[PDB]
Design a protein around this ligand. Structure first.
Ligand SMILES: *[C@@H]1O[C@H](CO)[C@@H](O[C@@H]2O[C@H](CO)[C@@H](O[C@@H]3O[C@H](CO)[C@@H](O)[C@H](O)[C@@H]3O)[C@H](O)[C@H]2NC(C)=O)[C@H](O)[C@H]1NC(C)=O
Ligand SMILES: *[C@@H]1O[C@H](CO)[C@@H](O[C@@H]2O[C@H](CO)[C@@H](O[C@@H]3O[C@H](CO)[C@@H](O)[C@H](O)[C@@H]3O)[C@H](O)[C@H]2NC(C)=O)[C@H](O)[C@H]1NC(C)=O
Ligand SMILES: *[C@@H]1O[C@H](CO)[C@@H](O[C@@H]2O[C@H](CO)[C@@H](O)[C@H](O)[C@H]2NC(C)=O)[C@H](O)[C@H]1NC(C)=O
Ligand SMILES: *[C@@H]1O[C@H](CO)[C@@H](O[C@@H]2O[C@H](CO)[C@@H](O)[C@H](O)[C@H]2NC(C)=O)[C@H](O)[C@H]1NC(C)=O
Ligand SMILES: *[C@@H]1O[C@H](CO)[C@@H](O[C@@H]2O[C@H](CO)[C@@H](O)[C@H](O)[C@H]2NC(C)=O)[C@H](O)[C@H]1NC(C)=O
Ligand SMILES: *[C@@H]1O[C@H](CO)[C@@H](O[C@@H]2O[C@H](CO)[C@@H](O)[C@H](O)[C@H]2NC(C)=O)[C@H](O)[C@H]1NC(C)=O
Ligand SMILES: *[C@@H]1O[C@H](CO)[C@@H](O[C@@H]2O[C@H](CO)[C@@H](O)[C@H](O)[C@H]2NC(C)=O)[C@H](O)[C@H]1NC(C)=O
Ligand SMILES: *[C@@H]1O[C@H](CO)[C@@H](O)[C@H](O)[C@H]1NC(C)=O
Ligand SMILES: *[C@@H]1O[C@H](CO)[C@@H](O)[C@H](O)[C@H]1NC(C)=O
Ligand SMILES: [Zn+2]
Lengths: 6, 896
């Protein structure tokens, strides 16, 4: 985790 | 229930059997970065707790060529044979090892296989990445990413986080490469033809998804923490300089975490490496944390204050995992918030503690507001729910497992106070060190803070308040959505009342009563009054309750500093009261109280509990507001109304907004320098305010920004742009076929992937269709614009009026290709879907998307993000039809 990017 | 060659594949459940526990893996991996493949073998020491004819473990896309079993304890299998029959069942990503003679309880055996595959093509398991050098050379590295279920694409293994084992890893490589893994390198030994082979110290007990290895030609900076851990930042050789800040921050955070958790990090080294092609933002592989370049690298000439803040966050997030996730691990993926919620929460404590100047404390409310959307829809989910197929497991990675989980932990910390919270944490970690917990182990450990304590009469409230703590949070984890607390003030008697907060569903809606059914939260209330700023605390366990105020007062402000995961409504004069206070003297409310009130007002309009003109009334005081968090929250609503208008053609309302924003606030916009000077909020304020002015074509702003761009382009990068306005200056620059061409060329040549990030944004604020689709086409290609960046690019394009339609057309007319590059449950596809549809706000668009989602369930594809989108386009349509003329007249009234 992440997951995201920004 | 079975297949492949024929035969009954002996095991049926998607989960593995638990009769064969793994204990130690000897893993030998031999990759070739020229043929882009690998050869490998493993020896697995297992203990059998039951008699069995077969062993079951995971394996996907691996070819298996030897299969033996051995034992020093079961003579029948004494060295070297026997050989096992291997049976593959891809649909469950399983293989079966067929033992010739039923095995013996309580004795140990040694499984052994040889496997091979091509290096991966995605962002999964053992895959290929490439980077560019300063001289325009393109190199190749091989890297692992396993979470949740892809270690099984690299080596057959009992691939579920309960099957913790020791790992012993050896890697073969050429002299131009190094090889990295979870643990330090004990031995390199040289070989015949000239190849080398690294041996790594055996791991501690650990889950398969965290095993890691990389073969690259990178460079590092190293340093030592106060307790002797060698931290190293690895990056491609031409970027070594960009690693300084990561080295500095990891050391202070790993220091902080050791002291805070009172538990040493156990390994001798901690490596952080910046991978050019990387899908997640980072992955917390024990001892070898991998990062998107933009999560780790920093460089003072092109990286902004926001950039630094992001890099610190992600670093603080991954180190937090070394304890939450690696040391203590979810029993299974249903309770994945146990590690992501906590890592997320700890970014706040650790970054606040180590870098208070970053003011991260004020940015944390945004994490929680951002999840209160989504969570105000009925398509939401609880923080723990069952999940079994791999896609569902990937789907557990979202604002709920992370953001919402971190937010309710904050609530609980504020309740029990930091000391009892820290203490509880330390006990959780100490107690499940090197094994696994589920939800209930956390709540027990968080509640419990010759004999340990002294006997008292007050002791009974220590055994009963503890039981309250556990009872409380199980409502916050097993229930979707968030509670609306409705307060009525009449007398010095406050009526309390909890509902489930719903958006695009008003108090008197045909669908309202059902959605309100069985929901009830133990909401730890707080509040203060106009009389005394002294916090009082009460625990609304029931759908109705009441409180007497020890005085009369102008206003009551519930949810102090917004520590709590709930929205507040005031019936009667409450809203009129508090808004008046803000109009007259606003500093008699605490800053975070202000941020919350602004937030909740606008959220309550959405719920129909309040008319928009009353929210828009509250923003008037922003002319006096110097606390940047509340000023920017406020602005953000006005700025989104504008873009929303702008996205439809509703240009009479848009032009009024543009004028009210530039007119009101004209003074604050005007104090802003085009520099990097001041604190972090100072600079967060500057970039915001200037971005707004150039979005609304303010003539000063567009002209300053346009000048900087020529000065920059006609010196070819010599004279330089302050970071805080870099994105603005470039995007105004991109408004001509000249600037845009130059910028696209500067993109390919740049060595700050944070600059690249700002350039590719700027590039997507162009108005020519040809330019926008070019950006996309390149994005598909993956040569100029890496494919790890495609999803965010479509999102930036769709966000703006000129790109709305193009992004939609593209996603529909290219869906098949999109899926060849990403998993259906990847954060990529989730964002590509959502980013191109969720801002739509019309009956027409709602129709088309409903259709395009239907068709995707003709084919074999289901995701929650489907309902959540539709519920968001519906939420939008209602908002307009139920509030737009109010916005039209409030502006016109205002112009008057
Ligand atoms: C990955 O595969 C490549 C080939 O696809 C391997 O490189 C090649 O194999 C050997 C091992 O280095 C080299 O053999 C000898 O090299 C000398 C050069 O000093 C040559 O004069 C000898 O006659 C002999 O051929 C071979 O040249 C080399 N070729 C190339 C183009 O690299 C490589 O070893 C493999 N790497 C791993 C880690 O398995
Ligand atoms: C697999 O990983 C586990 C950790 O999950 C390893 O357990 C650890 O084993 C070592 C060695 O037996 C223990 O060492 C201890 O430290 C001092 C060093 O000065 C030693 O002199 C002590 O007598 C003590 O044994 C350590 O306590 C233990 N840790 C835990 C948490 O159990 C295990 O060794 C690994 N297995 C293999 C096969 O390597
Ligand atoms: C593994 O062995 C255990 C013990 O021999 C088996 O568990 C027994 O029977 C039931 C059914 O699982 C359990 O609920 C009991 O706790 C056990 N009883 C005793 C006396 O130990 C278990 O069934 C075996 N597993 C398999 C897959 O056969
Ligand atoms: C893995 O299987 C290969 C065959 O695919 C084994 O190769 C054997 O090599 C020995 C000498 O080392 C020969 O005498 C045998 O005839 C080979 N077998 C076959 C089927 O050709 C190899 O030994 C196996 N390795 C391991 C570690 O099990
Ligand atoms: C990387 O950072 C180093 C650290 O300064 C730079 O290297 C030296 O910088 C000093 C300071 O002016 C010079 O006097 C030396 O001559 C520099 N040495 C070398 C070998 O360049 C270097 O310029 C930086 N490189 C990049 C690409 O940022
Ligand atoms: C808002 O209220 C504060 C608190 O009373 C005002 O600041 C103080 O004003 C009192 C008397 O009005 C003085 O005795 C204090 O010395 C002041 N302290 C500070 C820190 O300013 C403030 O002026 C009020 N502002 C408005 C616009 O009414
Ligand atoms: C927004 O309104 C403008 C002006 O009415 C539209 O611009 C043109 O409108 C005429 C008819 O009014 C059409 O024949 C043209 O096709 C329109 N031009 C373009 C480029 O669309 C505009 O279409 C409206 N909608 C937007 C901008 O989305
Ligand atoms: C932030 O740090 C200060 C000083 O270290 C501390 O007193 C404060 O409580 C911290 N904030 C949170 C939310 O822990
Ligand atoms: C969410 O709403 C849909 C229709 O609006 C309904 O079918 C579904 O059952 C709801 N989800 C629940 C009740 O969990
Ligand atoms: Zn995480």
């Amino acid at each position: 985790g992440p997951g995201r990017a920004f | 229930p079975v297949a492949t060659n024929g035969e009954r594949f002996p095991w049926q459940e998607l989960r593995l059997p638990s009769v064969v526990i793994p204990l130690h893996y000897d893993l030998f991996v031999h990759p070739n970065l020229t043929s882009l493949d690998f050869v490998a073998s493993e020896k697995i020491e297992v203990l059998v707790s039951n008699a069995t004819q077969f062993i079951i473990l995971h394996s996907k896309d691996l070819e298996i060529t030897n299969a033996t079993l051995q034992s020093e304890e079961d003579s029948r299998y004494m060295k070297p044979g026997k050989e096992l029959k291997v049976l593959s069942y891809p649909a469950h990503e399983q293989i079966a090892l067929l033992v010739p003679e039923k095995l013996t309880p309580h004795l140990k055996y040694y499984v052994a296989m040889d496997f091979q595959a091509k290096l991966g093509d995605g962002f999964e398991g053992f895959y290929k990445s490439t980077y560019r050098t300063l001289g325009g050379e393109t190199r190749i590295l091989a890297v692992t990413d396993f979470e949740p279920t892809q270690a099984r694409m690299a080596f057959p293994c009992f691939d579920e986080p309960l099957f913790k084992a020791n790992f012993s890893i050896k890697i073969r490589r050429e002299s131009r490469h190094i090889a990295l893994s979870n643990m330090p390198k004990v031995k390199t030994i040289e070989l015949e033809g000239g190849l080398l082979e690294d041996h790594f110290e055996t791991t501690v007990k650990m889950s398969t998804y965290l095993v890691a290895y990389i073969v690259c030609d990178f460079h590092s900076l190293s340093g030592f923490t106060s307790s002797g851990v060698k931290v190293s930042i690895y990056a491609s050789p031409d970027k070594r300089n960009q690693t300084h800040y990561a080295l500095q921050a990891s050391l202070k955070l790993l220091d902080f975490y050791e002291k805070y958790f009172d538990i040493y990090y156990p390994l001798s080294k901690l490596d952080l490496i910046a991978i050019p092609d990387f899908a997640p933002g980072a992955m917390e592989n024990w001892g070898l944390i991998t990062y998107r370049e933009t999560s780790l690298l920093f460089d003072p000439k092109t990286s902004s204050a926001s950039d630094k803040l992001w890099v610190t966050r992600v670093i603080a997030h991954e180190l937090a995992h070394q304890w939450f996730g690696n040391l203590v691990t979810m029993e299974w993926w249903n309770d994945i918030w146990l590690k992501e919620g906590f890592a997320k929460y700890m970014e706040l404590i650790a970054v606040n503690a180590t870098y208070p100047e970053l003011q991260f404390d004020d940015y944390f409310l945004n994490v929680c507001f951002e999840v209160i959307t989504k969570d105000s829809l009925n398509s939401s989910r609880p923080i723990s729910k069952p999940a079994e197929t791999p896609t569902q497991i990937q789907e557990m990675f979202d604002e709920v497992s992370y953001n919402k989980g971190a937010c309710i932990l904050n609530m609980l910390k504020d309740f029990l106070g930091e000391e009892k919270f820290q203490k509880g944490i330390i006990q959780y970690l100490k107690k499940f060190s090197y094994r696994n917990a589920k939800n209930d182990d956390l709540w027990s450990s968080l509640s419990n803070s010759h004999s340990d304590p002294k006997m008292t009469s007050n002791m009974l409230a220590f055994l009963g308040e503890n039981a309250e703590v556990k009872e409380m949070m199980t409502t916050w984890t097993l229930q979707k959505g968030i509670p609306l607390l409705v307060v009525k003030q009449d007398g010095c008697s406050l009526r309390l009342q909890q509902e489930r907060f719903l958006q695009g569903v008003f108090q008197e809606d045909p669908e309202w009563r059902a959605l309100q059914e069985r929901y009830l939260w133990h909401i730890p209330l707080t509040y203060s009054t106009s009389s005394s700023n002294v916090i009082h605390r009460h625990i609304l366990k029931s759908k109705t309750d009441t409180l007497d105020l020890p005085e009369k007062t102008s206003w009551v402000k519930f949810n102090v500093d917004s520590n709590g995961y709930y929205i507040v409504h005031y019936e009667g004069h409450g809203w009129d009261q508090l808004i008046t206070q803000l109009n007259q003297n606003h500093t008699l409310l605490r800053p975070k109280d202000r941020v919350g009130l602004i937030h909740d007002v606008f959220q309550l309009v959405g719920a129909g509990r309040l008319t928009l003109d009353k929210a828009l009334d509250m923003t008037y005081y922003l002319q006096h507001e110097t606390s940047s968090p509340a000023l920017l929250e406020g602005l953000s609503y006005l700025e989104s109304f504008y873009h929303m208008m702008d996205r439809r053609n509703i240009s009479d309302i848009s032009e009024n907004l543009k004028r009210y924003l530039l007119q009101y606030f004209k003074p604050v916009i005007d104090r802003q320098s085009w520099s990097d000077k001041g604190s972090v909020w100072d600079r967060m304020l500057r970039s915001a305010l200037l971005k707004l002015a150039c979005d609304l074509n303010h003539a000063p702003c567009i002209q300053k920004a346009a000048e900087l761009f020529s000065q920059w382009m006609e010196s070819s990068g010599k004279l330089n742009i302050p970071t805080d306005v870099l994105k603005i200056v470039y995007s105004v620059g991109a408004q001509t076929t000249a600037g845009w061409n130059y910028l696209l060329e500067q993109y390919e040549l740049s060595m700050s992937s944070a600059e690249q990030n700002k350039i590719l944004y700027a590039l997507s604020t162009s108005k020519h269709q040809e330019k926008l689709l070019k950006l996309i086409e390149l994005g598909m290609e993956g040569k100029v614009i890496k494919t790890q960046n495609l999803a965010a690019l479509l999102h930036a394009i769709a966000r703006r009026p000129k790109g709305q339609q193009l992004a939609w057309d593209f996603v529909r007319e290219n869906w098949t290709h999109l899926l060849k590059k990403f998993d259906l449950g990847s954060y990529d596809i989730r964002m590509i879907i959502s980013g191109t549809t969720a801002h739509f706000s019309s009956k027409d668009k709602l129709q088309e998307v409903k259709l395009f989602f239907e068709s995707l369930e003709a084919q074999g594809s289901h995701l929650d993000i489907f309902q959540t989108v539709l519920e968001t386009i519906t939420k939008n349509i209602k908002w307009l039809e139920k509030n737009l003329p109010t916005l039209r007249t409030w502006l016109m009234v205002n112009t008057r």
